[PDB]
Symmetry: C5
């Protein structure tokens, strides 16, 4: 329309997009900065990069773009594209993107009295420290530091406003706790003028159902199945097979859990501690199994049972678990030969009795070690799992 065309013609005349639009040059300009969180796109632990989808919200008061609505009755707002009017150079300080700026430049809406608005969208990839001390029951804080680049404290007075999360889209993996802001002034080696900035901290918790189902239960079940090696009779000859197969099935689980953890050498992750505990438990199980097997296949007439070991295993423990311990010249020549045969059979019987005693000792040792290892694995698993803070709150929220 004629009025809009005339207004656009008049506004740009003798306008310089390089000057700060203030009435008095000494007085700093006031800029209000806020944010509008929409979605946490990704939280990467290996690269420590947080990917978010937010809308910047900055508003100020231009002085030259003021007009009387009487002269132009139709038009009440004017929109200027990028590169025609002055805009604050607010940008992220700790960006991790290949290009340091990741804001899509949109139009700037202008009041009938100079109050400008600017709502650029964009997907921001910032760098924040990720803590894996209590994985996967951890809460992460990541900061977004915004501030003008080449404007001091006496030129651009940066103010702060509360972040808006009304349109937030809930994420499956993480649930948002809050996002408070803070404003501060800083000094730099470059210059002697303070540079204010606005910092937003995003506090989020990790939902633990997926990990608690695919990382903790299967390993516990496999360890419990490894504890069965202390029930197979020695004659089966499969205890070693069972032990090594379990060790392999946990080596592959070690690989799978290592594929995701970052190389941060600052703290030992909870899951790493617990997996290690399972490693040594299974290894000691294999060692005890070897000892038991070497007890069971003890060659008779090649040693004697030590008195201490005998009186311990066959009596003290047997009472403890109430397991009862098992158990004419031709005529003369014929006579002596049958005595020889009978004596051979008697020697065989004595050797069999000694072997039975050795096997019973092996069985008692096996039962004792089963009890000890079972109690040990329960106590260690429970202690490591419950050591982490907020564990009960997290499990209650995620499960019931």
């Amino acid at each position: 329309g004629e009025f809009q065309r005339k207004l656009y013609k008049e506004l740009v005349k003798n306008y310089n997009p390089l000057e700060r639009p203030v009435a008095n040059d000494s007085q700093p300009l006031t800029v209000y900065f806020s944010l509008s969180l929409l979605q946490i796109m990704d939280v990467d632990e290996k690269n420590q990069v947080l990917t978010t989808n937010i809308w910047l919200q900055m508003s100020w008061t231009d002085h030259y773009l003021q007009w009387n609505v009487s002269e132009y009755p139709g038009v009440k707002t004017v929109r200027f594209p990028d590169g025609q009017i002055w805009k604050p150079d607010i940008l992220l300080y700790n960006s991790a993107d290949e290009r340091f700026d990741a804001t899509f430049h949109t139009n700037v809406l202008v009041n009938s009295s100079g109050h400008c608005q600017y709502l650029p969208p964009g997907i921001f990839k910032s760098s924040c420290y990720i803590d894996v001390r209590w994985f996967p029951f951890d809460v992460q804080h990541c900061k977004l530091k915004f501030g003008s680049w080449s404007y001091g404290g006496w030129s651009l007075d940066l103010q702060m406003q509360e972040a808006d999360i009304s349109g937030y889209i809930p994420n499956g993996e993480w649930d948002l706790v809050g996002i408070p802001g803070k404003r501060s002034e800083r000094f730099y080696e470059c210059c002697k003028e303070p540079y204010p900035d606005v910092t937003f901290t995003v506090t989020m918790r990790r939902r633990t159902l997926y990990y608690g189902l695919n990382l903790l239960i299967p390993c516990v079940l496999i360890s419990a199945l490894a504890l069965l090696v202390f029930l197979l009779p020695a004659d089966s000859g499969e205890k070693i097979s069972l032990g090594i197969t379990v060790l392999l099935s946990l080596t592959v689980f070690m690989l799978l859990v290592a594929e995701i953890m970052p190389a941060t050498s600052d703290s030992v992750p909870l899951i790493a501690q617990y997996f290690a505990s399972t490693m040594i438990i299974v290894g000691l199980s294999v060692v005890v199994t070897v000892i038991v097997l070497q007890y069971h296949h003890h060659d008779p007439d090649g040693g004697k049972m030590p008195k201490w070991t005998r009186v311990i295993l066959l009596n003290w423990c047997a009472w403890f678990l109430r397991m009862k311990r098992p158990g004419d010249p031709d005529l003369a020549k014929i006579l002596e030969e049958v005595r020889y045969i009978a004596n051979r059979f008697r020697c065989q019987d004595e050797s069999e009795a000694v072997c039975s005693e050795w096997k019973f000792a092996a069985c008692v040792v096996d039962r004792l070690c089963l009890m000890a290892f079972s109690v040990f694995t329960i106590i260690c698993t429970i202690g490591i799992l419950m050591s982490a803070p907020n564990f009960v709150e997290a499990v209650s929220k995620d499960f019931a």
Copy 2:
């Protein structure tokens, strides 16, 4: 020729690409927004993004771009590139692309009356909630929300035309159900004006043939193979090995499925429920076979058959299972020797009889557990695979 040269020269005289091509500056400019789907490039599970090939469709009216075709014989349309005439700024609200506007800026075709046609293509990536509760029998609703970034409703009212699917090349994985669109107005606290926008919700159904044949069939087959551990006679001495090897080979499939799955924590997918159930079945089979091997290699002496086991295993279950249970002085001296040998044989016969009874008990337990486990695995697999809705429709449309 000279006619279109003169027309192009005179159409840009006192033209501002910053104004709104209206005639009263108090009547909103009507823009008709539509769509044209061509192909679904990708449906990412872990990233929760949707990649589609879309042509937009915008159409409005320009008041200044009008000419009499009588005075310009031959020319009926003109084309203007980007940045030369005013264009509506309509962009995808929810875009998962580092650049927030993935649109190729083509020309604008203008009729003599003044109609402007704009059809920019582009590969759009949008973030939508992907439901995984019913994997792989999935029906997903992903949304596309379009609207003007700056103009409101006093100036631009977005209408709708039905989304067109005519060049849509069918995808080999995702069936297309529909793509409806609704145009809704949203009011603000300030000003009683609408803010129209058009949203399109693509609805796709996942074809299940590939995932079925490659995941469901092999895991069911190996789970059935795990049941064969109940038919191997204990004397073979290789019963544990089959169980552990099956468990390992199936944990491999579990890792694969996990690597395909997202990491959400709002629900337990079907493919996770079924895998966990099969885990439990195989573990219970291993426990049972350890029990049976314990029964089989039972030392005859030093143990007695409990009353309960005697009164159950060999008489009740066998009847319920139709199992038949199997069961001078030199003369004196040589007499004592031969009677000693005979008594030795008598004792051996008694011991082997007791051992045979133990072995029969083991066989009975094997058969009973085989029947029980077969029934339980059939029931569990059928229940889990039939719980999901639209499963009958999925099989009907994919396997036949």
Copy 3:
């Protein structure tokens, strides 16, 4: 020089790089389109995209860039950069690249008569259907569609020239069959004018040496080696281990093909069919192994071999495979002792005779199942691998 400087100054005076350079503004402008294939660098089956190195080729006639060479001694051609002269807007319709136009922009060579040439290179990513029904004996067709985005047929008409393949660098995986095309004229319900376009279909055939030597051969070898479980005497005690280990190994092997196969439910791939066949074979082999081991460790007391099974396994099949069937009162007390011992030994001999008969039955079953399984696997593998078309052509052109 000076003449070319003067000519450059004269050629751009009153010239609008926005109008179609025609002499009547009512007749179409003839534009010739052609291709030049250089190299095919990636055929991605997962996302069904094709990556090629292509030089376009356009030519037309401009009515404003003409001069008398005799007037400008020495100047015969003039090159204009992008954006300074009118160009046809021909872009590929079905692109799979984030930027819809992945074409480097070069200069336009202009002859003294007004002719223009334009050979812009660029790597094109195109979305085409990749049929996988007959992997890896595969022949693919992928289409490329080029046409004007905005100009119609009253103004622009394309004329095809034959695709040129002279610099085509052969690929190590795909051989080229040809690249034909056809001019097409789309008509509208609008009004009687064509909309010319040129489309090229690239035909390629996968070379099967690598896949034949890396997948089809090792899996056949493993399946054949699984048949050795039928030559292992049961006394070894390591029969089930061999079969289960072979099963585990090949189901691990299946991951390599699983990671290349796309998730298409249109048809069942040939390689997937053949792997499923090998799975059925190995599973049934393990089942038969369990049956044999059951038949071999048979209790001689509780059971007698049925008449039918005897007459089928001991004479009929024995002849059908030509295997022979293997095979004072002190004196009184002494007499009773010795006859007791003799009767005990006689009973032992009868028991071992029955056991030997059972073991022979197991051996006959094992031999018969070996023969049956060998025939079944060879027949199935040959049928599956020969069911594919152009299989003789593939094995004649790749291996030989």
Copy 4:
């Protein structure tokens, strides 16, 4: 400075950055081309691409950028960015990059006499055929082709200056053998006009220490350890398990090897034709092991030993292998009893004496197969490894 300001103002007066800065418009402009290799970033076998780091060097002469130094005392050189002056358009004819021209555009240095220089750096990706026939002892020849895209031969004649490698940083896994070049001319069917071009063929050799110590040695060690199946006594009962475990480990090893090799079907790579040999060796090892286990667990009732087998195994080989080859009325009732017992014992002795020959035959065949496989695997591996060209040079340089 005033003088340089004046000169900058003068040099652009009436200067069209579109014309060849020649003096006669007839003779061509001689342009000198060269290169400056810095490092070889990566050589990709899978995609057949080469990424490098080079500095293009160009030089020519201008007829308009000349001035008298005595009139501008302080100025000797000037710099013009892209777009102000004429620059030759030289770019790779074979670039495997989405942008067909990856050169960072820097300034142009101009002397007082008019000479110009231009050194744009950039990371160049080129598509060169990469032979793989002799992996890992390989020598590659990748070509870079540079030439003007639009100017011909009467207008712009290239020259060649030998490539410069002085700041070259050696790669960790490639040895630069050289980088020659030569100038070639081409003609069209039009008219006798040379089309000069410059091409560089960088030749590189792969250092093989890492591959030799990572692949060749462990595979050989596993293959050699697979021969230990021929030292195990048959009574251990774990002769099969070692063979199958070796086969499984080497299958996963060959998958690890093949996940990096390109899928080319022009020739069989050395590493593949060596891994196939190892596969065949282990397969026949398992076959022979099955044969031995069949010969050893032979029932001494189902036939005899053929005379041919006797004379070939226990008569000839046993000598050749230098191994020793082992091997009152009641009185009548008592008589019958002892006669029966002794006859049973004699029958048992005959049976075991018969089985001893079968056990010896198994031992002899095992020794013979050990010798055969031990010689054959060594011969095969040494032939395959030493069959490659430049193997002696590779091993000498990379190990001494």
Copy 5:
């Protein structure tokens, strides 16, 4: 601001950005260079690139941009965007980035006296040599070279200032040692002029609390577990499956290292040689186990046990290890029968004695090899891990 507008119009009147802002035109322009390090985001070893977050600190003096603050009350600074004033060109010479300059072009701050200030951030990807001969106890020195691309020493003398790490953010994987710099010159055969440059060398140390626990502890624990084959009695029958499965489980660590380790061939990494040593130890253990099994299941009637073997094993090793080795005519017919049976038992006893001797020899050789292998493995592990610099520093700084 009226004064701001007036000064902005005044400062760009006849100002050529192409000219150096000096007032003599024959003197160099002093430029102060520095750098501010924020984070070390990535240290890639496979591609040997380093990613850092860096600010530059360019600074110079402009002769033309001076004004009197008295005549412009209030204005103290002005900011110019890219392309409006002269900016020195400083490129990172060794840049492994697709774009040869990944710097965000921010504003230039100018004081009243004319001093400029340019601090453009950007994420840089330098290329450095990653020495890996001491993995994971590693210390690296990547360099960073900066310099003017087209200015020499007569025109631009580049000074240096110390780097700024006051805002450094620690990385969990690397420990920063320091970052020195050196401003050096260079001459040419042309003419005696310097070419100043500033080179920053980044020294970082890897923290090993992660690798030392994930690849150093599990490997040594598995190696120790591999020695249990010398405590397992041979009667078990599972004496070599343990070792072969330990080898199977050990291959995965090699694959993990290969996927982490680069492909360089200039040395052998410490961890690579350590794992090679461990696999050699395990293979030798398997060979020795085969020897023991062969010595244990020895045929008694197969050969006299060698005198050397006696005088070694049964004479010296028994003492050294302190182990004691185990250990009417009717009546005539009756006589003959009992004599036959008695002699049969005598011969059986002799065979048993020989077998027991052989078994004891096997046991003693097993004990001896256990001792030797344990000593060898501890010596090898300690020597390999301690034959590396800064190992004591690494442990005392990380594990404490």
